[PDB]
Structure 1
Amino acid sequence: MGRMHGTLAKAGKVRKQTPKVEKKDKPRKTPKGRSYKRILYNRRYAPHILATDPKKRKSPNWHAGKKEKMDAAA
């Protein structure tokens, strides 16, 4: 256990260390209000989803990344 650089117990350590990563600029925007719950209904409780096997229904966040949105659309 011979790797040590910073003093133990320094206050801001982990937050200061963390690189600043910028929030991605979104093409267009996220609809506010009713329209959003429309969007949700569509991608979640809509007829086609219901028609599929309820035990095989796919969980809402399964994809973090876009490669599986490409695998989902195919």
Structure 2
Amino acid sequence: GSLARAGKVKNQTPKVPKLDKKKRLTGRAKKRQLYNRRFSDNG
């Protein structure tokens, strides 16, 4: 009988926009960046 509370919290939260550009690498170049960060400087 108390089904008027549905979707209460999702409608309560204040809204915040996404951030802008910060484009990411893809593919073989992204595997290169990870390899440097985990092993190249750790030695």
TM-score (norm 2): 0.69
Q: Is 1:20 aligned with 2:15?
A: yes
Moved >4 Å (runs of 4+): none
Deviations 1:2-49 (A, max 9, x none): xxxxxxx7111111111111110024x101111111111111122x21
Unaligned runs of 5+ in 1: 1-8, 52-74
Q: How many residues align?
A: 40
Alignment identity in percent?
57
Q: Which has the higher helix share?
A: 1
Letter of the 1:44 partner, please give it.
Answer: R
Higher relative contact order (CA 8 A, sep 6+): 1
CA distance in 1, matches of 2:30, 2:5: 44
